[PDB]
Design a protein around this nucleic acid. Structure first.
Lengths: 141, 180, 218, 82, 129, 27
RNA sequence: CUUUAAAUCCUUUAACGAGGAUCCAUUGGAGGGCAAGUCUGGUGCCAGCAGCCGCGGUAAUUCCAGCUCCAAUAGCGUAUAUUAAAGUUGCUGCAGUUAAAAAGCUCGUAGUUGGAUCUUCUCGGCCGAAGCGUUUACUUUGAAAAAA
């Protein structure tokens, strides 16, 4: 059982401090290795240069090809794989152009049937993918 | 350093559950009866009532003969009576918690214009207020969410410059009559 | 038409029982839903809390029956909960409504603070348990509504409660256990001894004893 | 029971166990209400009066219903002082 | 070993009340236990009790009218100011219409209502409802 | 009682439309 | 005009200014969670959707579009950090037989916890003062304590 004495504040506080390190979220947030391993460096978004276009096959139950891009970030020179969301949006991305990529929505975890992909392309060549998809804007000529 | 002030307060709260049928039905019913623009007006009045209720609960947790309880409760009760939300005789802190958002939505300038025979419908009342046809006592009031006080109820005229009260024909009437 | 098969039902159809609380007073079992129809049928409302398919593995395949959780009650302090498993949804819901009728219990209502007006909240903190589901009901100030999950909110609203604080612990995802724990917490409202109930019991004649002479000749 | 005005607002006042002073629940089907026939002093006949004892099912389930009813009857004068 | 004899007394009373016993034997007695029992009795929860005087430490036989839902101790005896009393009432008491919190204050051992009436905080001993 | 959704559910209690039919049956 | 060093912007007074009042509201979504279509056309485990479960293999309610609807609304979606939800860090308030879990066992210091018991004095400014002349915790009061 837990100690409940009027002079046990030190024991309770120290035990809580020690036992918080056994929490996955707390340890990831405070021990400071996830941030150093994070290619974004804690940023919400990042900018990179599209190195090549790849097709990642879906998982076991789903059969499809996800058109992703190998992107080399400018801030730290790390190579990541970023998902180009909609259909025919890979036709807007070319070789060697700037691309703004965000997370995939699970704080660094793979999303859906795409294996090992945690980033999605948000903007290409300073014009958003949504604008190109809906025709609101066109890629610079 | 600047002489400017930054104290700014959000007047509403969004509900915890976005899509629940009961809450959506009640909010749309309130909008329908009182002719409100959107859901944020309902949320604003609900926030006002919630703050009032929180104050009432705080005061009710104190002793009956507590100077802070007495002073703050008398102030709150007088304020709620002055805007006509509370009855003149229901001047206890327990009757605060028994109030509803209806008691506050009934005191808007839209509702009072519609219920004083000044407008055909509540949406007509809002259109009248937003177009400077309505005045209170002497000031031309233009904001439909104006919560009229109890002594301000008896003076809601039809302005002195509006076509309905001031007699100067409006743009449409003038243009139509000038070609006839 | 309704022909009672039990002594209590015959007494009820004989207009010899003045109220359902008189039947509750002696804790007599109710086995004819027609009694509840007789006493509160004009005010009872039922609500299908859930339909769930339950499968039994067999040689040929999976035999699927349907379990209906139905909460009934009038919004004046009587509520019941009934669960019925049957081959088809319609008869499962019918049986669940009947069972909810048979399980209707009185609900005691109280005051959080001052006792002005009519009772609005639970008389005291009560708690129901059902297979790891813990449901605590706490008196709440007048006009605060029911602060609860949708399922206990339905059960509490149907019981005549309009101000209540709630706490739930365990696998509340399982709607059946959540509903049963809420029903148990509601049912415990009249089983909690309170200083105003310290007055000595003044016993009254049982429905059967008072009206035995009625069927002594019959 | 009573509100501020004093009117009784509860649906009903429940029965209490004669042996434990506990409320008998409305769905407690094991509970009993025994009537013990009062007997006139000199003849020994059932004169129409009786003593009522309500016993909760919890007491019956543990076997103390008999001892409790005997104690209640002894305290009522139904059972001679042995 | 045995510490906080008030805890043992209250636990024995609670166990006997749940079991439906009409009398409960408490040992050892103490001034705190007797004061707590008197606070209980003044509110009609336990009724009369008798202190068997041994020449080492008393025992107490408490008659148990069935009126007690729960009697409990608070350990450690936290200091309770008058402004902090309402939080303890909310945490421990089943309702605001009944139930008591017992405090040892400089004016004696008393319920929370009496301590609030005499404008004195103290250390929380326990509760009963 | 509505029978159309009940039959649609009873045909396949765990099909593609099972969740919607069960949700429609609740209320 | 008014404002204000000049301006501007509000406010005020004029003139013109609305019928598709074209003076044309958007952002997300429509299987469930969670509000709202197993309508129509196309695609056919492809392209894609999908936070999760899942949808797509030639009648797809889930993709691409048309129509319809509904959520908020001059705002809405997304990424990330953080808070509540989390009684999933538990002092309030979690757990430890089998789900993760009690040291192989005992001794032992610091730590933590600890049985009953104790009902003014040098006299003094319309008769002329005791207000700790053995200690802490605790509780209550008072003083002192920036504004925002």
């Amino acid at each position: 059982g837990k100690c409940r004495g009027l002079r046990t504040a030190r024991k309770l506080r120290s035990h809580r401090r020690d036992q918080k390190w056994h929490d996955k979220q707390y340890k990831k947030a405070h021990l400071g290795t996830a941030l150093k391993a994070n290619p974004f460096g804690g940023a919400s978004h990042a900018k990179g240069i599209v190195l090549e276009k790849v097709g990642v096959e879906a998982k076991q139950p789903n059969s499809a090809i996800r058109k992703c891009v190998r992107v080399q970030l400018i801030k730290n020179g790390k190579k990541i794989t970023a998902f180009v969301p909609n259909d025919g949006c890979l036709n807007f991305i070319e070789e060697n152009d700037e691309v703004l990529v965000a997370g995939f929505g699970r704080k660094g975890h793979a999303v859906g049937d795409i294996p090992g992909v945690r980033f999605k392309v948000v903007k290409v060549a300073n014009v958003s993918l949504l604008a190109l998809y809906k025709g609101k804007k066109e890629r610079p000529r | 350093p600047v002489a400017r002030s930054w104290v700014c307060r959000k007047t509403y709260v969004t509900p915890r559950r976005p899509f629940e049928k009961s809450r959506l039905d009640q909010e749309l019913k309130l909008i329908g009866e009182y002719g409100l623009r959107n859901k944020r007006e309902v949320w604003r009045v609900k926030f006002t009532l919630a703050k009032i209720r929180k104050a009432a609960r705080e005061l009710l947790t104190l002793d009956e003969k507590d100077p802070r309880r007495l002073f703050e409760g008398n102030a709150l009760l007088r304020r709620l009576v002055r805007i006509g939300v509370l009855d003149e005789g229901k001047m206890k802190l327990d009757y605060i918690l028994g109030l509803k958002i209806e008691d506050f939505l009934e005191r808007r300038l839209q509702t009072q214009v519609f219920k004083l025979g000044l407008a055909k419908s509540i949406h007509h009342a809002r259109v009248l207020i937003r177009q400077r046809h309505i005045r209170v006592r002497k000031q031309v009031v233009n904001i439909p969410s104006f919560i009229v006080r109890l002594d301000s109820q008896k003076h809601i005229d039809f302005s002195l410059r509006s076509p309905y009260g001031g007699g100067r024909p409006g743009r449409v009437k003038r243009k139509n009559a000038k070609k006839g | 038409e309704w022909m009672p098969v039990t002594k209590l039902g015959r007494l009820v159809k004989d207009m010899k029982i003045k109220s359902l609380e008189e039947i509750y007073l002696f804790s007599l079992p109710i086995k004819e839903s027609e009694i509840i129809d007789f006493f509160l049928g004009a005010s009872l409302k039922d609500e299908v809390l859930k339909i769930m398919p339950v499968q039994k593995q067999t040689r040929a395949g999976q035999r699927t029956r349907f379990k209906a959780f139905v909460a009934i009650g009038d919004y004046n302090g009587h509520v019941g909960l009934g669960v019925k498993c049957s081959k088809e949804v319609a008869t499962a819901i019918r049986g669940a409504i009947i069972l909810a009728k048979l399980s209707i219990v009185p609900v005691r209502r109280g005051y959080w603070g001052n006792k002005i007006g009519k009772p609005h909240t639970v008389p005291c903190k009560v708690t129901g348990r059902c297979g790891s589901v813990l449901v605590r009901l706490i008196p709440a100030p007048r006009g605060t509504g029911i602060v609860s999950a949708p399922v206990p909110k339905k059960l509490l609203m149907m019981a005549g409660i309009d101000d209540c604080y709630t706490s739930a612990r365990g696998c509340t995802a399982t709607l059946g256990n959540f509903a049963k724990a809420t029903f148990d917490a509601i049912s415990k409202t009249y089983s909690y001894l309170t200083p105003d109930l310290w007055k000595e019991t003044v016993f009254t004649k049982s429905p059967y004893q008072e009206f035995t002479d009625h069927l002594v000749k019959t | 029971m009573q509100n501020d005005a004093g009117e009784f607002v509860d649906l009903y006042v429940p029965r209490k166990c004669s042996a434990s002073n506990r409320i008998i629940g409305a769905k407690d089907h094991a509970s009993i209400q025994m009537n013990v026939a009062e007997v006139d002093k000199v003849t020994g006949r059932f004169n129409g009066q009786f003593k009522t004892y309500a016993i909760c099912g919890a007491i019956r389930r543990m076997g103390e219903s008999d001892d409790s009813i005997l104690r209640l009857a002894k305290a009522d004068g139904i059972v001679s002082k042995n | 070993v045995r510490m906080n004899v008030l805890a043992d007394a209250l636990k024995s009373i609670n166990n006997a009340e749940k079991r439906g016993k009409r009398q409960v034997l408490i040992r050892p007695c103490s001034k705190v236990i007797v004061r707590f029992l008197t606070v209980m009795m003044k509110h009609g929860y336990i009724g009369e009790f008798e202190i068997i005087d041994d020449h080492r430490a008393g025992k107490i036989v408490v008659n148990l009218t069935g009126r007690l839902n729960k009697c409990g101790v608070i350990s450690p005896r936290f200091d309770v100011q008058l402004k902090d009393l309402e939080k303890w009432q909310n945490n421990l008491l089943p309702s605001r219409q009944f139930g008591f919190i017992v405090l040892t204050t400089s004016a004696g051992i008393m319920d929370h209502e009496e301590a609030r009436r005499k404008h004195t905080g103290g250390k929380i001993l326990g509760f009963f409802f | 009682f509505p029978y159309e959704v009940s039959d649609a559910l009873q045909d396949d209690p765990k099909g593609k439309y099972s969740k919607k039919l069960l949700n429609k049956l609740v209320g």
